[PDB]
Amino acid sequence: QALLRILKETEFKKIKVLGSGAFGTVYKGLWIPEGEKVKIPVAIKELREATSPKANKEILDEAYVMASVDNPHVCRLLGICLTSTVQLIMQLMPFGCLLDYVREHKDNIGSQYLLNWCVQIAKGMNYLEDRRLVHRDLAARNVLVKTPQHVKITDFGLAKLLGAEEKEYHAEGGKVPIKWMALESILHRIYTHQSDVWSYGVTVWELMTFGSKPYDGIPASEISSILEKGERLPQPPICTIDVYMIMRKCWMIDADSRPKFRELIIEFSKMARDPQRYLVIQGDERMHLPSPTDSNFYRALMDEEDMDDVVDAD
Amino acid sequence: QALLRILKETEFKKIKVLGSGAFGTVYKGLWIPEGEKVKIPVAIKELREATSPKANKEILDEAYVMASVDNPHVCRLLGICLTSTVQLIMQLMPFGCLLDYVREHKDNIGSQYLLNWCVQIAKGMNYLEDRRLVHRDLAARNVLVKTPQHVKITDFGLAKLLGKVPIKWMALESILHRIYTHQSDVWSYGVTVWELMTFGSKPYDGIPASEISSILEKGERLPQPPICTIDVYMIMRKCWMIDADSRPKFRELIIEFSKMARDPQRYLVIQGDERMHLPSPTDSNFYRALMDEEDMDDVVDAD
Ligand SMILES: *CCC(=O)Nc1ccc(OC)c(Nc2cc(-c3[nH]c(CCCO)nc3-c3ccc(F)cc3)ccn2)c1
Ligand SMILES: *CCC(=O)Nc1ccc(OC)c(Nc2cc(-c3[nH]c(CCCO)nc3-c3ccc(F)cc3)ccn2)c1
Ligand SMILES: [Cl-]
Ligand SMILES: [Cl-]
């Protein structure tokens, strides 16, 4: 399986730490091809230890699946280093993750960017469902910005790889994303494509609120209770009722009543052709998608892979 | 049209000098998109102050042409900054130019890399000929290494834009009459191949440029490289025929070097060649996904 490069400790080095999450620590790194004089920037995540003593062969098998994804909106695992720690290597995304991007660019994001991001996340998740892969940790922090016009899903399958100890599902601010999880996942560890759809709804809510924390101030131990009582995330100020109803449909108790990712692609694509009808943002008229000139420059410089055209307004 | 972005001085910064040529100084630069927090590496060439400056409308017209090339083996001009100086911006090639690459790798380059580089250069030049574009300064220094498996021609059209003269790469008719054609580009292709097969030797070492037209008229040519079978050397000699129309075509050079690339050790005799193969599919997939995602024809591999 030539899609996963087995790297030795000697051919790459971790430099600047970029962040930390439930799954490990992310570094900006340099790959030094053997026999060459160049240093190639990469992203390295040094994983925390799985909650099970699984063979390196099982770790490699699951890494091969992560290296097999071929879709413009899913990040492909490129390499792995199995020494004392498991280190994953992929292409460096210099714009960061979408959660931090929307927080940092709050007052300058228009409806066309927001709706296209929802389309692209749904396209990537639809591909994962087609591959019979459940993400288990879809969130705005796990959507990466290759360019502001091109986002890609990362960290799929890591939850099942590393697992989580049972106490973390009852702790505060722990490793378990309780506030993104479907009720059936909280209560019974049930993870399906339809529970991914629930997390997609929370992810869209993150984007439409420009990075607000869902259920902020509500203890994680009481999330399952308030969900059972019918409480849900509030309507973001910029969202029309059409957009808010889609999010609410993603959080229905009956998993089979939730939308499908293929349906979400179509609906958000429709709204992207009339963006100001579905999101109300002030000064939206000067927050257009890039001109063809800037798009050509963007692509040739740092994003040469094939991708569907962004959905523009009619 | 929309293929050439006009940049402001404030949105990019030169950080490192990478090299210099007859036309100007090359910098590693950082592009800083307005409103963003990222710094994107780019290559910047600041052109030197010409003695017969061109009009700004003329400069932009040629920059649009340079920005219109769409081929995996020709570098596309991406941006320009037109102030007191002309600055050209394109994607940064971190492996450098092919001339310095083959010199630094003098002792580890295998026959399969050398022959494929000849294939790829011929593919890029054939595209330029398809576009009715004459390069005028093809040389190993003007071939850039995006990956060791993927080289691209740069600096086409700069010679005409700026009106220092690479006599030892030029066809005789270009030396005598300043005639530049696709067939004179073929002559420079022959010298470029000689550079690669000698691992970056200087052509006509010890002969002053003022004497080159004289020795060419006497029938003297660059010698057979030690690693080249006569099959490869005969192609080079055909590129240096006095009659431009008897020289090979770039389309023909693609086919011949591709043919040799399928049995590389038959056509280049290199010491230790039984070690330096092309990357495995694993290593090639890793290279492309990391830094070379553009569409390209696959390498010609030995069968
Ligand atoms: C908000 C989370 C984040 O990743 N921020 C961020 C700041 C600066 C960056 O470069 C200047 C990047 N680039 C990047 C990140 C990742 C990545 N992000 C995560 C989530 C962390 C917390 O949610 N995980 C990864 C990752 C890294 C390496 C792998 F092999 C697999 C997954 C990937 C690529 N580029 C991001
Ligand atoms: C052989 C000369 C050379 O360019 N060496 C080299 C050393 C280090 C590098 O990056 C670490 C690069 N990258 C690169 C170079 C160029 C480029 N090279 C030339 C010719 C120099 C002598 O002929 N001209 C350019 C150039 C730059 C910007 C433009 F708009 C047009 C042409 C381009 C991209 N990356 C090279
Ligand atoms: Cl993480
Ligand atoms: Cl130059």
Residue A243 maps to which CATH number?
A: 1.10.510.10
Residues of B in contact with A40 (CB under 8 A): 94, 290-291
Task: Write the residue with the smallest CA distance to atom 19 of ligand 1.
Answer: A142
* Residues B80 and B98 reside in one and the same domain: no
Q: Which of A144, A153, A213, A302 to mutate to test the pocket of ligand 1 (most atoms within 8 A of CB)?
A: A144
Q: Is B294 exposed, middle or buried (0-12, 13-18, 19+ CB in 10 A)?
A: middle
Distance of residue B300 Cα from the nearest chain A Cα, in angstroms: 19
On chain A, the residues whose CB falls within 8 A of the CB of B31 are 301
- Under an 8 A CB cutoff, do B2 and A293 touch? yes
B108 with B248, same domain? yes
Put simply, the answer to whether B2 touches A296 (Cβ < 8 Å) is yes
Query: By three-state DSSP, how is residue B219 classified?
Result: coil
Domain boundary among A41, A72, A92: A92
The answer to the question of residue A233 being in a domain is: yes
Secondary structure (DSSP) of chain A: -TTSEE--GGGEEEEEEEEE-SSEEEEEEEE--TT----EEEEEEEEPPPSS---HHHHHHHHHHHHT---TTBPPP-EEEESSSEEEEE---TT-BHHHHHHHTGGG--HHHHHHHHHHHHHHHHHHHHTT---S---GGGEEEEETTEEEE--TTHHHHH---GGGGGSSS-SS-GGGS-HHHHHH----HHHHHHHHHHHHHHHHTTSPPTTTTS-GGGHHHHHHTT--PPPPTTB-HHHHHHHHHHT-SSGGGSPPHHHHHHHHHHHHTSHHHHB--TTGGG-PPPPHHHHHHHHHHH--S--PPPPPP-
Residues in chain A closer than 8 A to B76 (CB atoms): 300
Are A34 and A169 found together in one domain? no
Same domain, A182 and A274: yes
Domain endpoint, select from A72, A92, A112 = A92
Instruction: Look at residue B22 and give its three-state secondary structure.
Output: coil
Q: Do A297 and B78 touch (CB under 8 A)?
A: yes
Chain A hits for B280, CB-CB cut-off 8 Å, are: 2
**Number of neighbouring beta carbons within 10 Å of residue B141:** 21
Beta-sheet strands, E only, within chain B: 5-6, 12-20, 24-31, 40-47, 79-82, 86-90, 143-147, 150-153
Tokens at A240, concatenated:
């029309």
Residue A293 lies in a domain: no
- Inspect the interface and report whether the beta carbons of A40 and B290 lie closer than 8 Å: yes
d(CA B71, CA B128): 9
Which of these three, B57, B92, B127, is where a domain ends?
Answer: B92
Q: Residue A2 and residue B36: Cβ atoms within 8 Å? A: no
Instruction: Provide the domain count of chain B.
Output: 2
Atom of ligand 1 nearest to the CA of A21: 22
Binary contact (A108, B79; C-beta < 8 A): no
Round to whole Å and give the CA distance between A91 and A146.
10
User: What are the backbone angles phi and psi of residue A97, rounded to the nearest 5°?
Assistant: -95, 160
Judgement on whether residues A85 and A141 belong to the same structural domain of the protein: no
Listed residue (A241, A229, B110, A110) closest to A249, CA to CA: A241
Domain residues for A64?
A: 1-92
Quote the CA–CA distance of B12 and B34 in Å, as a whole number: 10
Residue A84 shares a structural domain with residue A141 = no
Structural contact between residues B163 and B50, judged by C-beta atoms closer than 8 angstroms: yes
Q: Are residues B75 and B121 in the same domain?
A: no
**Is the minimum CB–CB distance between B79 and chain A shorter than 8 Å?**
yes
Residue B212 lies in a domain: yes
Segment (H or E) for B173: helix B172-177
- A292 to chain B: which residues are within 8 Å by CB? 2
Q: How many CB pairs under 8 A join A and B?
A: 69
CATH of the domain at A22: 3.30.200.20
Closest-approach residue (CA) in chain B for A43 = B290
Do B122 and B87 lie in one domain? The reply is no
Which chain B residue has the Cα nearest residue A31?
B290
Query: Which chain B residue has the Cα nearest residue A305?
Result: B293
B272 interfaces chain A, CB cutoff of 8 Å: no
Question: Which atom of ligand 1 lies at the shortest distance from residue A91's CA?
Answer: 34
Cβ-Cβ contacts under 8 Å for B41 (sequence gap 6 or more): B28, B29, B30, B31, B92
Query: What's CA A148's distance to the chain center, in Å?
Result: 14
CA B106 / ligand 4 centre spacing (Å): 24
What's the rounded Cα separation, in Å, for the pair B126 and B71? 10
Give SS3 for B17: strand
Give dist(CA B283, CA A188) in Å, integer: 42
Instruction: Decide if A236 is inside a domain.
Output: yes
Beta-carbon neighbour count of residue A213 at 10 Å? Answer: 11
The C-alpha torsion from A63 through A15 and A300 to A294, rounded to 10°, is 120
The CA R_g of chain B, rounded to the nearest whole Å, is 19
Residues A58 and A142 occupy one common structural domain: no
Q: Which residues contact ligand 2 via a Cβ below 6 A? A: B 18-19, 21, 26, 28, 43-45, 77, 88-90, 92-94, 96-97, 99-100, 141-142, 144, 154-155
Rounded CA gap, A222 and A219, in Å?
A: 6
Q: How far apart are CA B71 and CA B123, in angstroms?
A: 9
Q: Does the C-beta of A97 come closer than 6 Å to ligand 1?
A: yes
Calpha distance B111→B116 (Å, rounded): 9
Residues 6+ apart with CB under 8 A from B106: B199, B200
Q: Which residues have C-beta within 8 Å of that of residue A32, sequence separation ≥ 6?
A: A11, A12, A13, A38, A39, A40
Contact residues, B window 277-296, toward A, CB-based 8 Å cutoff: 280-283, 285-286, 289-295
Of A34, A184, A83, A106, nearest to B287 by C-alpha is A34
Q: A158 with A263, same domain?
A: yes
Burial zone of B279 (CB within 10 Å; 0-12 exposed, 13-18 middle, 19+ buried): middle
Is residue B88 within 8 Å of residue B47, measured between CB atoms? yes
Same domain, A99 and A236: yes
In terms of Cβ atoms closer than 10 Å to its own Cβ (0-12, 13-18, 19+), residue B189 is: buried
Residue type, B160: K
What are the tokens at A79? Answer: 């390499």
Same domain, A195 and A219: yes
Dihedral Cα A115, A121, A126, A129, nearest 10 deg:
-150
Q: Whose CA is nearest to atom 12 of ligand 1?
A: A96
Active-site residue, B263 included = no
Question: In sequence order, what are the beta bridge partners of A214?
Answer: none
- The DSSP code for B45 is E
Interface probe for A, chosen from B30, B38, B39, B75 (most Cβ of A below 10 Å), is: B38
Resolution of the experimental model, in Å, one decimal? 2.1
What is the rounded (10 degree) CA torsion for B227, B144, B16, B20? 70
Residue A112 within a domain: yes
CA nearest ligand 1 atom 34, residue: A92
- As a whole number of angstroms, the distance between CA A95 and CA A147 comes to 7
Are A149 and A295 spatial neighbours (Cβ–Cβ below 8 Å)?
A: yes
